[PDB]
Symmetry: D2
C-alpha cells in the first residue's frame, strides 16, 4: 500500500518531471552510460534528503541502476506533492501522510528504517541531516552489522559521525560528499548567484540600479551574492572578519568596510559609525554566526532600508528586540512593515519605517523557489555515484582481521568526481580532448584519470 497526501494529483507539477530531467543532464547522462552493466543490482537503500520536484530523479536513477528503495519525507515540508503521487501509481512504495507537525516527524523516520517491524536489510544508508543515523545506534542495533557504508549531505551530520566514530560506537565506514568539488561550487557559489537577485526583486518589485548595498561575510555564498548584485549595476560593499576573504574581495573589485568604528564592538551607542549606515539602502547577511546585525546597528539605519539574510540561523539579525517595542504590519503575503516610532499606534502617513523580506528566515525559500534545476544536479549525481564505491566492496562480508583495518570515514574519490563533471559538461554541447600516449607519460598521468592530486585547490 501507499499513502503520501492524496491520489488524484497528477498535473500540477508532475509535467516538470520531463522538464527538470531535460534541464538536469548528468543524471540522464550516466543512466545511458551504465546499461546492461548494473553496478547497483541488489543494493538496498532507504533514502531521505529533501523531497522536491527535482528530487525524485535520484529515486528514478537508483531504480534504473537496480537499487531497491522506500522513500520517506525528511523535515520542514513533508509533502511537496507536486509529483509525489506519481511514485505510488508507478509501483514504488512511498509513505509521507502522517500527523502533520514537526514534533512527531520521527514517526516518518520509523517507517523508512524498517519494512514490517523488523529492522531492514540496509547495507548503505541515505540521509541528509543525520535524522536517521542516531536511530540505528541508539535504538535498533540489531541489523546494523550488515551495513557496508553510509553517506550524508551536511556538516550537522558529519560533525557527530566523526565524533561518534571517535568513541567507537560507529560500526560502519562512512563517505562524505560535502567535500566534493562539483558539490561545493554548485550548491554554494552558483546556486545563490541565480536565486538571490531574483528573490529580492520578486517581493519588493523595486529598481536596484544605482543603489548602495552591504554584504555581511565573503565566504562561499558571499561571492555568489556579490556577483548577483553587481551584475545588476548596484554599488556593493562587503563586511568580513577573515583576512584572506577580505583579500579576495579587494582583488575581485569590491570595497570592504566595518559596521563598527575600527571593527571594535562593545555594545555602546557611541561605537556604531552612523555616517556610513545612514546612506545604505540594503543589508544582507551571509555569515553562519549569531547576532551579526546588532540592535544599536539597526536603529541608526537609514530611513526605508531593506533587511535580508541568506545565512543559516534565525539570530543573525536581532529579531528578539525586533518582535518587541515596535509594531508589525503585513502588506504582502511574504513581506512586512515595521515602525520605529514605538510599540503601537503608528500613523498611515508616517515616514519612519523599515521593511523585512523574510523576518529571520532565508529569503530564497520564503520569497523564491530554492535553487534552479541544473545547479543542484551537480550533487545528486554524487549521491547516486557514492553508492557505487560502497556496494562494490562488500564490507559486511569481510573478515574481522580485515574489517578493523578499513573502518573509517572517507571522502569521495576524484575519479567519480571527474566522471560526473564530464557527464554534466556533455549536456552543454562541449567536446573534451584526449591525450596521446606520448603526452601522458610526459605529464605522469593515466588516460582515464585522475589528473590532479588531492592537495590541488580548484
Amino acid at each position: 500500500d501507499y499513502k503520501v497526501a492524496d491520489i488524484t494529483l497528477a498535473a500540477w507539477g508532475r509535467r516538470e518531471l520531463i522538464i527538470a530531467e531535460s534541464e538536469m543532464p548528468a543524471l540522464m547522462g550516466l543512466r545511458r552510460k551504465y546499461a546492461g552493466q548494473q553496478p547497483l543490482k541488489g543494493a538496498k537503500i532507504l533514502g531521505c534528503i529533501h523531497m522536491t520536484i527535482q528530487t525524485g530523479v535520484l529515486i528514478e536513477t537508483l531504480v534504473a541502476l537496480g537499487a531497491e528503495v522506500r522513500w520517506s519525507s525528511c523535515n520542514i515540508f513533508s509533502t511537496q506533492d507536486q509529483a509525489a503521487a506519481a511514485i505510488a501509481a508507478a509501483g514504488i512504495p512511498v509513505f509521507a501522510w502522517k500527523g502533520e507537525t514537526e514534533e512527531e516527524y520521527e514517526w516518518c523516520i520509523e517507517q523508512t528504517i524498517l519494512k514490517d517491524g523488523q529492522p531492514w536489510d540496509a547495507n548503505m544508508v541515505l540521509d541528509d541531516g543525520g535524522d536517521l543515523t542516531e536511530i540505528l545506534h541508539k535504538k535498533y542495533p540489531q541489523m546494523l552489522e550488515r551495513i557496508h557504508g553510509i553517506t550524508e549531505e551536511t556538516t550537522t551530520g558529519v560533525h557527530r559521525l566523526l565524533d561518534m566514530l571517535k568513541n567507537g560506537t560507529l560500526k560502519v565506514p562512512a563517505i562524505n560528499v560535502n567535500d566534493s568539488v562539483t558539490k561545493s561550487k554548485n550548491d554554494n557559489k552558483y546556486g545563490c548567484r541565480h536565486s538571490l537577485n531574483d528573490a529580492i526583486k520578486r517581493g519588493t518589485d523595486h529598481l536596484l540600479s544605482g543603489k548602495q548595498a552591504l554584504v555581511i561575510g565573503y565566504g562561499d555564498v558571499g561571492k555568489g551574492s556579490s556577483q548577483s548584485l553587481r551584475q545588476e549595476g548596484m554599488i556593493v560593499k562587503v563586511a568580513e572578519v577573515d583576512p584572506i576573504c577580505a583579500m579576495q574581495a579587494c582583488m575581485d573589485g569590491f570595497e570592504v568596510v566595518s559596521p563598527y568604528k575600527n571593527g571594535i564592538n562593545d555594545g555602546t551607542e557611541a561605537s556604531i559609525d552612523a555616517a556610513l549606515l545612514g546612506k545604505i539602502d540594503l543589508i544582507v547577511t551571509t555569515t553562519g554566526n549569531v547576532n551579526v546585525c546588532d540592535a544599536n546597528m539597526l536603529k541608526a539605519l537609514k530611513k526605508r532600508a531593506v533587511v535580508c539574510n541568506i545565512g543559516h540561523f534565525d539570530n543573525e539579525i536581532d529579531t528578539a528586540f525586533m518582535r518587541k517595542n515596535w509594531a508589525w504590519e503585513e502588506v504582502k503575503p511574504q513581506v512586512h512593515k515595521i515602525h520605529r516610532t514605538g510599540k503601537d499606534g503608528f500613523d498611515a502617513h508616517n515616514d519612519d519605517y523599515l521593511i523585512l523580506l523574510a523576518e529571520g528566515r532565508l529569503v530564497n525559500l520564503g520569497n523564491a523557489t530554492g535553487h534552479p534545476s541544473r545547479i543542484m544536479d551537480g550533487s545528486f549525481a554524487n549521491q547516486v555515484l557514492a553508492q557505487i564505491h560502497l556496494f562494490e566492496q562488500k564490507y559486511a562480508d569481510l573478515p574481522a582481521a580485515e574489517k578493523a583495518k578499513r573502518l573509517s570515514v572517507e571522502v569521495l574519490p576524484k575519479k567519480l568526481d571527474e566522471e560526473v563533471a564530464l557527464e554534466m559538461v556533455k549536456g552543454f554541447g562541449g567536446v573534451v580532448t584526449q591525450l596521446t600516449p606520448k603526452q601522458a607519460e610526459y605529464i605522469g598521468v593515466s588516460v582515464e584519470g585522475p589528473f590532479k592530486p588531492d592537495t590541488y585547490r580548484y
Copy 2:
C-alpha cells in the same frame, strides 16, 4: 667585496624600489609591526633568488629585522645592473654577476656556501633554483651542525626535497612556502590577468573586439587569461582534457571545443577539424603539456593568425616543423613573421603567412615586465615569516634525543598566512572587524586564532 657587474648604478635601482615599496604593503607592515622586539637577531642567511626590482625589498626586510647576511644570485643573467650596486654601496655583500656562462653559474652558486675560504655557519638557506639545497650534501657535508632550516620557492625542487627525505641523506627541516594561498592566488590567477592582453596589444596593436580566439587549458593561468581576453569584447573558446576545468568554463559563460574531430588525436591531417580553425584569429597555450600545438594544427590555420605561449614549458608548440619547412622574418625587435610559401625566397607581399610573437616562449620574456609589485607581494611576505617561525624553533640547539621528531617537510601554518593578508587588506584602506567573546565561542574558534580548517578550499 664590491665584485658586481657594474658599481655605478645604485641610485636608479633604489628610486625604482621606492615605488615598489609604495605598492607592496606587507613588507613594511611587518617591518613596522615587529619592530623593536627584533625576532630575527643573530640568524645567518645565505640566499640566491634572482636580484631584481622586487627581491631587494625582501633582502632589506630580512636585514631590517636584525639579522646579518651575505648574498649572491642563482642566475647570473637575472641580475639587475642597477639595484645590485645599492647592496654594494652598503656593508651588505653581494655576488650579482652577469658572466653569460654556465661555467661561472656553478661558481657563483658555490660561492654562497663558503664564508670566504671555509664554508659558512648558515642558520638557513633560501633557494629558488634548487641547486643550493643539493650542494650542501653533494660537496660540503660538514656545516649542517649549525643549520636550522631551509626555504624553497620553486617547484621541481620540492619534489627533490621529498625524494631526499625518503633518501634519508638530509639533516635539515624544510618549509614549503609554495602552498600558501597568498602565494597561490597572486602568482597564478591574478598575475597573468593583468599582463596578458597588455602584452598582446604592446606586441601587435591589434583591435581585439569582435575577434574569435581559442584558449588551450583552463587552469589557474587559463582562468586568468580567459577573463582578460573576454573583458575586451572578444569571443573566447576554451579546450581542456580535465572535465572539472571544462565545467568551470561552462558555468562561467563560455564554449568548450576540441581541435580534433570528436577529440581524438591521430596526427594525420584527415583527423583535424579545419572548419573551426579557418575562422580562429588567435591561439594561445596556457598548459604545461608537450606538443600541444602539433605540426598539423598550424598548417591548416586561417591566414594572418596570431600564435603565442604563456606557459613555462618551451615545447608546447611545434617550432621544429616551422624551422624545418617554412621561412622566418622579423618585423620588430621582438616580433617575427612566418611565411608559408616555402623555406626561402618569400614574396614581397604574399597573402599566405602567419605571425608568431616570441618564438613560442614566454610572452613575459621581453614584451612585458612580468608582474607589478603589488601581485608578487603574496610571495615575498611569506619568506620572512617562514624564518620567523623557523628561527625560534632551534632544531640544531635541540638535544639529539628530541631532534628525531623534527625531520619532515612543513607546509606553512595557516596562522602565519592570515597575518600576511591583514597587512595587504590594511594597505588598501579597508577595515577588518573583530569578534566578541560570545561570537567566537559560538562557532568554535578563538578571537585571535585561525578561522578555517585545512580541508577548506578558498
Copy 3:
C-alpha cells in the same frame, strides 16, 4: 455619481498609494516645489491614460497644483480598479470601466467631456492613443473654440498630428513627448534591461549561465534586451538588416550572423544557414516588421528552444503557420509548449516540442509587472510638466493676428526635460555641479542651461 464598479473597494484600493509615492522623487518634488504658487489654478483638464497605480499618483499630483480633471482609460486591459476608486474617494469621480462593447469606452469618454446634459468649459486635453483628439475635431467642433491645448505620448499620434497639419484641419496647437530624451531612454533602453531577465526567470525558472541565444533586431529596445541576457551568463548573437546598427553589435562584443545563405532569402528551404539554427536555445525578437522569424526559421530550430517577443504584435513570428499545423498544450498561464510532431494530438514524453512565452504578444509586461515605478517616474513627469508650460501662452484668447500663426505640432523644449532629470538624480542621492560665471560662457550656454545642442546625440 462616480462609477468604478466595485465602489466599496476604495479602502482596499487606497492602500498601495502610500508606499508607491516614495519611489518617484520627481512627482513628489513637483508637489513640494510648485506648491503655494498653484501653477494650474482654474485649468480644467480632460484625460484618457490607463489607470493602474501611478497614473492615480499623477492625478493626485496635478490636482495639488490647482487643476481639475475628469478621467477615463485608454488601454482597456490596464484598468486596475484599486487606484481609480482611491482617487474617486479622494474627491473626483472616475469612470475606469473596461472595454466591454467599446461603447462604455466611448461612454466613459463621453462622460469625461459631457456633464448631466450639456458640454461645458475645458482647456487642456491629455490623451493616450488619439481617441479623444479625433472626437474634438469631429463630432463636437464648437468646443474647440475654447480648447487650449493637446498633449499626446505615442509615435502613432505624432504621425497623425503631422499629417493633420499637412491637410490643415488642425485647429489647436499640440505638444508631443515621445521624441524627448528622458522618456525614450528610460522606456526603451533601460527597463527592458531590468525587466527581460526578470521575466524570463519567472516563467521558466531555467538556469541562464553558459547558454546560447539569438536576438533579431538591434535598435533601441534590442540593445537593452541583449545586455540583460549577457549579464546572466549567456552567449548571444545578433541578426540585423541595417549596416549601421550591425557595426555597433560587433564593436559591442557580439558576432553578427545571418539566418540565410549570404543573407539572401528567396522562399526556398535551401536558402537558410541550417548549421546555425540547430544549435540555438533562446530567441528574442525586437523588431517591428512582419516575418522577421519566418516559417523556415522555426522548422530548422534545435529542440527545446524558448521564444520571446518584445516587439510590436503577432506578425514578427509566424504564429499563423503555427496554428494550422502544430498542436498546443497548456502548462501555466504564462507559458506554453508547442509540438512540431503535428496537429492531431501528442504524447507527453516527446522531445520535438517548442516553448512559447506570452503567445504572440509582448512579454516583458505580459509575464511580469513591466517597468518599475522609478522608470515610469520620468515618463509621467513630462506630461504633467507639459500642461504647465502649455498654459501661460493663453491661446484661447489670442486675436486672429497671432492665433493662426502659432498653430504648430512640436516636441518639448529641452529645458523642461532637464528639469525632470534633476529630480531623478536627487532621488538616488547624487549631487550635480554648478557652473561659475567664468566657466559657462566657454561652452556658450548660461548657468541654467540647456547645455546641449538640439542635434546632439546623447
Copy 4:
C-alpha cells in the same frame, strides 16, 4: 623638392605599409569593387590629410581610383617618418617637413599649389587644416573660380565653414563629415575604451584592481572611458554638470558625487568636500572645459593620486598653479613626480608628491600609440566618398542661375555612410540580411535605401 631628412627610409617603409595594409577593410573593399569603373578619372585632387602609414593606403587607393594628388602636412608634428619616403618612392611629391618648424611648412603650402610657379590646375581640395581654405581667398583670390568641391575633417574647420556661409564668400559646395554616424562613435567612444587602460598601464605599470578613481564628465569619451576602468576591477565615481547624462550615469552603475558641498562652487576652501578627496587616488578628466580640476582639489587630494587627462588642451586641470610653486622631476619619458612640498627642500624619501603623466596635456597620445588601425579605418574612408560625391555633382558645369540654388552646406548623405558601415562589417566576418520587397514597404523603404529617419538617434 623632397624635404625628408633621408630618402633611404622607404625600403622598410613599404614593408610596414604592407603589414598595416591588411588592417583596413574599408579602404581596400572600396577599391576592390569600384575597380574597373573610373569614378575619379581626371579628378585632380589636392589634399592635406595627416599622412601616416595607415593613410599610405588612403593616398594609394585615391591615386589608383583615377585621381592625381599632391600632399602636405597641415600639422607640424602629425607625421610618421617611414610613410613619407615610402610614398615618395612611388613618385608622389610629399613636402612633409621633418625639420618641424612653422614657416617651413608655411612655405610648403604655397608650393603645394604651384606646379612650377604656375598654379596647379586642380579641381578639388581634400582639406584637413583649413589654412589652405583661408589663403584660397586671402593670398590668391584667383582660384575661387576654378575649384568646385571641398571636404574637411576637423570641427574647428566647420565652425568657420558653415557660419561664414552667411555672406557666400566661398560660392562652392562643401560637405561636413564629423557629425556622421560611423565617425561619431569610432574616434571617441570605442577608441578611448581601447586605449585608456593601455596608456595608463604603459606609464604606471600599476595594478588597477582595488583602487579608487574619479572620472569627471560623462560624454561619449566619458562613457567609453569608464568601462575601460571598470573592466580592470576598479571602483570609480562619475560627476557632471548636465543632469541628463548624469541620469544615464546612474543607470550604468556609477555613483554621482560632487567635489563641492551641495554642488555650489564658491571659490573658497570651506566648500570642498574633504570626505572623498582623502581616499580617491586617480583622476581622469573627460570633459572639454576650463578649470574642471582647479587648485583646491589638488591641494586636498591624497598622496597616492595619479593625474590623467583625456581632453584637448591644458585647461581641464590647473597646470599653471603647479609651475610657480612646485618643482617637477622626471622618472619615465612621459611620467613626472609633482612634489607638493614646494620648490626647495628636495628630499628623495618623501611620501608627499603626485604622479603627473603627460604634463597635464593629452595623456593618450603622449604615453601610448593611440587609435588602432581598424578604428581609424572608419574615420578616413568618409573623405574618399565625400570627394567622390562632390565629383559626381559637377558644380562647375551647372548654369549660373541654377548655381545659385545648388550652393549649400550639408552633411554627408546617409546612404554613403551605410555603405561605409557595410564595408567595415565584412572585415569582421559578419553577414547582413537583405530585405524582401514585401517587408520593404511595410516599414516604408526600398530594399537598399536608407532605413532610418533622418533624425533617429542610434
